[PDB]
Design a protein around this ligand. Structure first.
Ligand SMILES: Nc1ncnc2c1ncn2[C@@H]1O[C@H](COP(=O)(O)OP(=O)(O)OP(=O)(O)O)[C@@H](O)[C@H]1O
Ligand SMILES: Nc1ncnc2c1ncn2[C@@H]1O[C@H](COP(=O)(O)OP(=O)(O)OP(=O)(O)O)[C@@H](O)[C@H]1O
Ligand SMILES: [Ca+2]
Ligand SMILES: [Ca+2]
Ligand SMILES: [Ca+2]
Ligand SMILES: [Ca+2]
Lengths: 300, 300
């Protein structure tokens, strides 16, 4: 019964943000990042909580005020968040993901270790957001946890980098590494294949050309996201990249042949940190990661 | 030999920010707040350090990169900082203060406890600065420590709320408390008397009137600074207030009689925290502090 999770997500977020938009607004304080609040949904029902078809669950909203601030800094009006996520069926896919009917939000699960680490990331995330306004890291809208009979599933709601609205003719999941970085042929048979690194280097060996103008932003704001990531001892993150070819949100690019492109990029899987690996190893992953994307994958 | 401190301040800041403006710029990370860097000035001299008339000292710059960011967010070009402070004599006054020849910077000493607490305040300070852009808290430009033979003097360089450039006809140091809040008559004989709270309530008993427009900013951004301060368990801070009467930086106000004013305000002495006092006591100081200034001291 996946349906028992979709509903518990949808029920609880409504109750969480619903009750918040009545409380009046205030600034975020360091105190707000470690708050975790819990509301209880009996199948019978309660004075606070409506009854439902699914079984009894507690719904846990992590760091609620801080994600209110993050959502607003991101443009996510509360009424839209709630409608998109809690008032329309959720599609699965095949860590475990979902999407909104809208295709604007992605949900993902996260190991207890990864959610706990997100909580510690918040202040540095706040700092990066408020310094590097064109950063590529995940746009985190909320951290939640549904408590089943004796298990916890932990969800982080975040932004969809590749929306149905723009048609993606190429997909890539890149890391700057080579080992097994080649699309499992099971995946290679989708019409929407998310090719990996070796796949890239042969299919697109003259690269993705960028103007002297826009290539500089990338090189600059990636050096920034990599300095942020290695600071926090993070690894195994990919630069996900969808390409679209022509005959408004993304980057404009020129093809090896010369067709005009619009490239859509973002850094994903940033919650595995190492705070046995070496002292200087996450720095190695960053320097590689960046010297790759900003030489092999995008050039001037 | 106060002169031996003025010089050690001036020598070390030059060396600290001088060496920094050659290093290339990057974003602030949580890691940067706890850094403390030390450079050594022998009276003989060194390859790194010039010789001097004063005795040997180590100069300690606290959280250097974070204060570079704070200075820039505040408008303080590095060349100006350095000239003002390190390239012109420093005036004393009669905790121990100085000023720049310019009258734009104030220096103050801080107990080891207070400096150590500033270091912990940095991330919440970063958060407040980047949320409440019209906040009243001290503008901190740097935290430094000069190590004498066996003693340490710890300085925080910050902004002068009452500059010689505007003539102040009134001064006040207000807290929302009454006990001994009445200017020591020793001070009461200066031509520039910094009256306290009881002094205010009788000399200006019809208050400082403010437009419905500007009175709202104050009430709003003070409720914000007080929510920040009590969060950090801080007390004994005063709202310092200088008044100027007419016949461009400050607030415009109307007098009980009706003359047109320009009021200059700021919150000072915020480094005494309590992280024996009650759980809810710093909150009491804030609610009082604010319900005072935004009823007795400024009205609509
Ligand atoms: N924010 C996002 N926007 C668009 N697509 C995404 C997003 N996050 C994940 N995906 C899709 O899921 C894949 C990456 O999943 P991710 O690596 O984040 O999760 P995971 O289960 O931890 O993966 P891995 O097993 O590689 O560590 C990508 O190849 C991408 O196509
Ligand atoms: N940033 C500033 N701008 C202008 N004047 C200031 C500033 N800081 C301090 N002063 C002057 O010094 C006085 C306040 O000193 P402050 O209370 O900050 O230091 P202190 O020695 O800890 O004082 P106290 O003994 O009251 O705790 C004020 O009355 C004011 O006139
Ligand atoms: Ca991955
Ligand atoms: Ca992972
Ligand atoms: Ca004081
Ligand atoms: Ca004090």
């Amino acid at each position: 019964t996946s349906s028992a999770l979709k509903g518990a997500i949808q029920l609880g977020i409504t109750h969480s943000v619903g009750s918040l938009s009545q409380k009046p607004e205030r600034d975020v304080l360091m105190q707000d990042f470690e708050v975790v609040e819990s509301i209880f949904f009996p199948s019978q029902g309660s004075s606070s909580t409506p009854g439902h078809h699914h079984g009894d669950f507690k719904f846990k909203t992590y760091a609620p005020i801080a994600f209110r601030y993050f959502r607003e800094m991101f443009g996510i009006r509360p009424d839209d968040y709630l409608y998109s996520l809690c008032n329309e069926p959720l599609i699965e896919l095949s860590s475990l993901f979902y999407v909104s009917s809208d295709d604007e939000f992605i949900i993902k699960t996260v190991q207890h270790k990864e959610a706990e680490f997100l909580q510690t990331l918040l202040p540095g995330y706040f700092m990066n957001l408020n310094q590097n306004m064109r950063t590529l890291l995940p746009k985190f809208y909320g951290l939640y946890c549904v408590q089943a009979d004796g298990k916890n599933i932990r969800i982080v709601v975040m932004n969809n980098l590749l929306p149905r609205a723009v048609p993606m003719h190429l997909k890539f999941n890149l890391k700057g590494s080579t080992y097994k970085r080649r699309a499992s042929p099971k995946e290679r048979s989708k019409g929407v294949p998310t090719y990996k690194d070796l796949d890239f280097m042969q299919d697109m060996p003259e690269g993705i050309l960028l103007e002297n103008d826009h290539y500089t932003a990338l090189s600059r704001t990636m050096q920034r996201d990599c300095r942020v990531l290695q600071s926090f001892k993070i690894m195994d993150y990919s630069l996900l990249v969808g390409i679209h070819i022509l005959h408004m949100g993304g980057i404009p690019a020129f093809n090896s042949k010369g067709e005009r492109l619009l490239v859509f990029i973002g850094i994903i899987d940033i919650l595995q940190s190492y705070r046995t690996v070496s002292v200087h190893r996450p720095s190695f992953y960053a320097d590689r990661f960046q010297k790759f994307m900003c030489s092999t994958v995008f050039r001037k």
